[PDB]
Amino acid sequence: MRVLITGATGGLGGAFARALKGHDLLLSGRRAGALAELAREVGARALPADLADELEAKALLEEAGPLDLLVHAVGKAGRASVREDLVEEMLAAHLLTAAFVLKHARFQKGARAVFFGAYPRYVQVPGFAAYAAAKGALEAYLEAARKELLREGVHLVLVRLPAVATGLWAPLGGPPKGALSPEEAARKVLEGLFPVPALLEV
Amino acid sequence: MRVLITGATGGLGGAFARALKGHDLLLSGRRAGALAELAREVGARALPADLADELEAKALLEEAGPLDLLVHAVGKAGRASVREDLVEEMLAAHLLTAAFVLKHARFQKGARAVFFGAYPRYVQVPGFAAYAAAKGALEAYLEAARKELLREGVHLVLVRLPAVATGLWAPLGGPPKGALSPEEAARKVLEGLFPVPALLEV
Numbered sequence: 001m002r003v004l005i006t007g008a009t010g011g012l013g014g015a016f017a018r019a020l021k022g023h024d025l026l027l028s029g030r031r032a033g034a035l036a037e038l039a040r041e042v043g044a045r046a047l048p049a050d051l052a053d054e055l056e057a058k059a060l061l062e063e064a065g066p067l068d069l070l071v072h073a074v075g076k077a078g079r080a081s082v083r084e085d086l087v088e089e090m091l092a093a094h095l096l097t098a099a100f101v102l103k104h105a106r107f108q109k110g111a112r113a114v115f116f117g118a119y120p121r122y123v124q125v126p127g128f129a130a131y132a133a134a135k136g137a138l139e140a141y142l143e144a145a146r147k148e149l150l151r152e153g154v155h156l157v158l159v160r161l162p163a164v165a166t167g168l169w170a171p172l173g174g175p176p177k178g179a180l181s182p183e184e185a186a187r188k189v190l191e192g193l194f195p196v197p198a199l200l201e202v
Numbered sequence: 203m204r205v206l207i208t209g210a211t212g213g214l215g216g217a218f219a220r221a222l223k224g225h226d227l228l229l230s231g232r233r234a235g236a237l238a239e240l241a242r243e244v245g246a247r248a249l250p251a252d253l254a255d256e257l258e259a260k261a262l263l264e265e266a267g268p269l270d271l272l273v274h275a276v277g278k279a280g281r282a283s284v285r286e287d288l289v290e291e292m293l294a295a296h297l298l299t300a301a302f303v304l305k306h307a308r309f310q311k312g313a314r315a316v317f318f319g320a321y322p323r324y325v326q327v328p329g330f331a332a333y334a335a336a337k338g339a340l341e342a343y344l345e346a347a348r349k350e351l352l353r354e355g356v357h358l359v360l361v362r363l364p365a366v367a368t369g370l371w372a373p374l375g376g377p378p379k380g381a382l383s384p385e386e387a388a389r390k391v392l393e394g395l396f397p398v399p400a401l402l403e404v
């Protein structure tokens with residue numbers, strides 16, 4: 001399959017990249033150095049970019065060509081009260097990257113496009129309003145776009161993951177207790193994706 | 203009560219302004235001319251501003267002083283597919299205005315701050331992804347900020363209104379069939395706000 005993994009330089013992205021290395025893989029991220037080495041390690045193509053910049057997102061997708069699978073493991077985290085530019089940074093990282101990618105992506109019929117939201121009860125708490133808002137927006141955006149994409153034969157998949165041990169938690173003091181290994185989260189997602197008709201009578 | 207109605211020049215905002223004219227009312231909007239006349243009509247103070255500009259939002263709230271009630275009747279509408287800057291405009295109009303206002307607002311203990319979200323099943327449909335996302339973000343932002351504000355003795359109220367006949371639908375071809383009159387929507391909201399203990403034994 002032709003696979004594009006954005007956020008490839010992140011915790012989840014890297015797990016997905018190694019789990020899918022047998023495919024025609026394209027990896028994208030902001031840290032070019034880290035990106036190039038991972039791509040080389042898994043035999044993929046490295047195409048660095050800032051997906052919050054629509055022109056860069058557009059050039060990435062036009063270059064990638066028709067995709068069978070897209071995994072947008074893009075995001076950023078932050079903690080702050082609403083009473084004292086985090087909101088804009090969060091929306092840019094989570095929503096704009098996804099919106100620009102989804103708008104310019106070339107898809108094969110039957111393709112799947114995976115995005116990551118969040119369990120409402122877990123993020124909609126003091127200190128995470130900005131993050132919660134960004135994910136609330138992303139999920140709403142995708143649900144609305146759902147029928148539009150299906151018309152093109154593309155299936156949008158919204159993933160809700162529990163805490164995962166990655167660098168995302170760096171500015172938050174590290175992952176919480178019991179956070180899944182990124183490899184395990186990717187395995188479960190890929191497993192959630194893996195029922196085909198046994199008999200087709202035309 | 204000291205009341206601030208942002209989006210006062212809009213359909214809902216105007217209804218709220220006329221319904222609350224007996225109070226110490228402050229009205230804000232972008233169209234200065236329309237704003238000044240409504241304010242004069244209801245004996246309120248007119249303070250025009252672009253709430254997507256944080257410095258303007260900050261100056262408005264510092265000038266308004268401690269509020270007993272805030273009604274953020276701010277927003278914009280638009281229709282577009284996700285496959286072909288609406289998303290950023292929607293987030294700015296619905297979320298950033300609310301976030302900047304909520305951050306700099308001065309509140310009296312017991313104050314209420316009203317915001318407008320949307321019924322998910324109604325907006326999360328083809329053509330309204332951007333709008334849906336903005337409202338999805340706003341509701342998530344507020345739910346998270348809920349406990350933070352309660353600590354200050356402030357109650358955040360999230361309102362979900364059905365279609366209402368206002369200029370919001372202008373770029374969409376006009377309000378749908380059965381859309382409520384803005385006056386009726388405001389009456390119901392104000393009614394939803396209006397149970398006090400009859401006996402307090404200290």
Ligand SMILES: NC(=O)c1ccc[n+]([C@@H]2O[C@H](COP(=O)([O-])OP(=O)(O)OC[C@H]3O[C@@H](n4cnc5c(N)ncnc54)[C@H](OP(=O)(O)O)[C@@H]3O)[C@@H](O)[C@H]2O)c1
Binds near residue numbers: 011030116117
């Ligand atoms: N980790 C968790 O506990 C958890 C839980 C629920 C959902 N999620 C979501 O899962 C996804 C991946 O999270 P993660 O744990 O892998 O975070 P991560 O380790 O910090 O990786 C984040 C990725 O996003 C990329 N990115 C950020 N801004 C970008 C931009 N403007 N343009 C292009 N790429 C950008 C980063 O690229 P660079 O590093 O190269 O700059 C990085 O590759 C995110 O949507 C996250 O919100 C995570």
Ligand SMILES: NC(=O)c1ccc[n+]([C@@H]2O[C@H](COP(=O)([O-])OP(=O)(O)OC[C@H]3O[C@@H](n4cnc5c(N)ncnc54)[C@H](OP(=O)(O)O)[C@@H]3O)[C@@H](O)[C@H]2O)c1
Binds near residue numbers: 299320
């Ligand atoms: N109408 C409906 O069917 C419906 C349904 C559900 C929810 N809602 C929500 O209810 C609220 C009011 O809607 P409405 O029907 O009254 O819309 P409306 O008639 O178009 O009024 C919108 C108001 O938002 C103000 N505004 C927009 N951008 C602004 C900015 N950047 N800075 C400051 N003010 C800004 C506009 O000011 P100017 O006109 O002066 O530029 C106007 O006062 C919105 O949140 C809307 O999404 C409406």
